[PDB]
């Protein structure tokens, strides 16, 4: 009797409190080993937990998303997920891709050339990183050229400035040459 | 034999109704550290929770949803996971794509530009926020110019009419250049 | 190793045999504690358990769907899924787009203040709900009008007879100026 | 040391086979607690178990699929998932939807009510359930018209017989007037 | 000391392994309850085991997929899935869907008599199962009919042969009459 | 206390543990029971696993992918899922669709017969396998044909040799008679 | 009374906690067995954790992506993933399809060994791995060839040179014949 409510008890008590008793663990070992600062955002593959980080408790962390609206994350969630960092990004990149008209394939080379010329030396990228242009993809409508840069600034103001004009470069030098693009261009085959 | 009888029936009682105690467990700790109030309304990127609350139970919290229709939560979805209290925010965002048409590409800073400087005069748009107008999606159809600023009122009623006049100006900003924005179009090739 | 023996027995009946008590326990939990009566229809996001409650067992709950099928749900699904009642709604919704044509862009403000207008005068609308008209969209293919009202009745007959009324008068107002809708409508640049 | 290998070889073995005394006490629970019977077919939501059953054992059960081919589902699945009964229904249903032409709006209220009229003097149609005939949905290349009604028979083959004849009045009447149906029906902007 | 560190050694000597003894003794039980033979091919709705079996061991079975190439499937998924023998089938099931093209809309009730009398009266059709002819879908670009029905033959070779010479006389049937079935079709309102 | 103390660590131990006593049980088992050798590739319809296996170690086991590049898989893995042996295949497969121009339903039975006979005198063809050619498809805009046959051969560079083969005799097969194959072919129906 | 305690105690600390120490033990054993170094980079199938390793610590291990970002990632994730190592790769594959226009199929062989022959003699191209090059899919719109091949270089700079010299080699062989590409061309049956 006396065994019968006190070890069978104590076995649903301390299986179903299990949350509870993770959520404080985490907290502690977040106190302890800190993987972000508060006023930097993180980022997460697996969950949604995309903001910036207000306050750290010992249950549950604020986070301040882009919304500017609070989101209240448990702390056990920190020790099973992969935490990204954004906020001690050392630079940030560019990607794109051009997609030429198919029938244009003598103007490649000289297209990829004053494309890879001109990144090369403008002011606003970083020289020590990686800078590929490459026709790397033949799609199925164009043929695609890959742009891959860095930015030595990440204050994600002069880094669209500087993106908006490598990209009107982009447009200028392709309109040098005869491409002016492509569009998905099918064939019709009428009866 | 009585000792492993009460064993083996106060584990299988402990771990059939772990549920029931997680919920009442979840509850008393909600009592204790409450992370919203009544009187609004809360989201979560994980399970569908969305509505305002209405009250909160020691088993379940009941949620007028926006259909005008009771939800009930069981309190042990609250620790484990995220949880968003839009009622809490501090400013509105208004998030939007121009997407010209491909052909007008010197007519982009310009537009770029005169948008932005009419967002900076708008008596509705908090100068205090983010506000980035820039051309940075180079779309397979269209040339794109995203739109991001915050409002400076949270009610629903003059944000939106706030977002409808903004959309109005750009508009009217939009067609005094020639831009008249762009279709999917693709090509042909007839045979 | 009698002990051990009952011990091992014990422990492998509680592995099997949890979902059984796990019902039993969801079932008399539901007897203490309902959150639905009999003769309302209920909803979960969660899981598929649409329909009419029946009848409720102490292992399972018979619901009559709408197709005048019985489904029988065991009782501890409830303990751990969100469950929604919408026979306890109070109004019922509706909420419908409009999409102009892309070119009647002067026309906008006019149609939308028409129909808010016609929206408050209606005698079938609850005025003391919800009730937007805006632009808020920049669709694709059209210019998108949101519309959000509540009905005074709930009774699925008199709704969506309101609904048609409503839904004929917007496209009388629609048409009334030069409105007439909008289709995919893309380009083709024939070569 | 006995009572400790006694122990740790126990429970191996109940974690290792608790699936096989978890189906023979589902097959148990099925024997004292049966939700169909056997010249039934059943259904589930959340598994395909589709069929009619045939026999009821001690560890699974086996069903007749509708190719005429045999399945075996262990009884552990029927503790934990909704079971639907179709083979008790006590009405088919009818439903579809009419989709007109977008430009005959003014011909949707006597469409409606002469749709409305022949369903409720159909000699196959149950006259004590739902009947909804109602234009709610508004679709972006059509004016749809839900229909929704409930036959007397459930034998798979009359049922069949009564759709198509409502199917061909329906399309008769439409065709009465000036409907004729509808298409995707976009447009193209040609240049 | 020593019995907590036996214990201890124990648990996790039984929680590490508990797959293997999984294994063996699904397979004892499929020695002891087998509900497929040897050569014969079965299929599951929830994993992918399709192949005809070669071996069944204490641990693992073999399985011969249809590419000729060995598969293993560890004997523990048996006692958790659905598994279907269609090795064990008595008839194989003709299902097809006709289309016709939206304008022949008086033909429907001709063709469909003419296409059950012919399937009444082929001689590879079994007679004493489903056999059903009827127009039950209404879809966006054609009017629709399902053709449902059972072969007296098994072996995969003259089922496919009769399938083939009941489309082609279906071909034939349709175009006795003026139906030529459908395509897309939408329309295109030029500009 | 001490043995309280004790038991509480080795439970922790024992529950934290887990994976990597698995991860050697389930390597030892491997050494007892292998179900692949080294220099043959192997797969999984569960987890991605492609490539062929180098080396077998205690806790995990190296795999080179088609791509040259090392993969390290945990050895638990083996014991829960279905793992596939191509290494060991007699024959490999040809399957393919011809798919007609949906006019030319007249050719259907003597380009079946055509394709079959050429079949049946390939060379390269084994003869004692599966060899279907059968129309039993009926697509919504071309009459499918399957092909169904295996080779003798499973170097994956004669197989490759004698596919090219048999598509350019069954092109030639094809366009011996008027078939000419088949594309989308929709209907357009101006306004 | 204070054994029970002491148990149900350690038992819930146990049950929580079970993360943290299991990152641990995780992280220990990649210190004696580790299957990466510092100066690589590595790639999941399962998990997204791409990026070069920065550091290996005893509960997470921090990876810099290619955004320049840190990632943090817990160690017990290597003990369950399968862990792929690209940094130690021996050569880059290119892969590539072709697509004719269906039209002409007179020149496919003759194409296929230029091709072939092209690829065998360029410097760039490992000789001693696998080498394809056939025509084996028989696409819906245009017959594909499928290319396969190595380089012997893998520091990603003059491999994407050396693939954008072989694609623009395989159009120039391509235009030598009259092959011309292909695209997604239907047809339109015009009414």
Same mark, same amino acid.
């Given at each position: ?8 008890? =104590? *076995?649903?008590?301390?299986? @179903?409190? %299990? ?9 502690? /070992? &977040? ?67 051009? =997609? *030429?008209?198919?029938?244009? @394939?003598? %103007? ?9 010329? /001109? &990144? ?72």
């Amino acid at each position: 009797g006396l065994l019968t409510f006190g070890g069978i008890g =104590g *076995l649903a008590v301390g299986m @179903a409190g %299990k949350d509870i008793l993770s959520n404080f663990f985490s907290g502690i /070992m &977040l106190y302890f080993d800190r993987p972000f600062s508060i006023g930097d955002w993180i980022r997460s593959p697996d969950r949604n937990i995309e903001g910036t980080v207000a306050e750290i408790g010992w249950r549950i962390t604020k986070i301040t998303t882009f919304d500017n609206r609070p989101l209240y994350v448990p702390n056990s969630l920190f020790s099973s997920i992969s935490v990204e960092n954004p906020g001690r990004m050392t630079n940030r990149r560019i990607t794109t891709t051009i =997609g *030429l008209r198919y029938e244009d @394939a003598a %103007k490649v080379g000289v297209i990829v050339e004053a494309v890879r010329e /001109m &990144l090369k030396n403008h002011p606003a990228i970083d020289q020590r990183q990686t800078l590929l242009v490459y026709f790397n993809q033949f799609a199925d409508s164009s043929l695609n050229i890959m742009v891959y840069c860095f930015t030595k600034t990440t204050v994600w103001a002069e880094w669209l400035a500087a993106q908006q004009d490598v990209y009107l470069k982009i447009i200028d030098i392709v309109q040098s040459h005869g491409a002016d693009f492509a569009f998905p261009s099918q064939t019709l085959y009428m009866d």
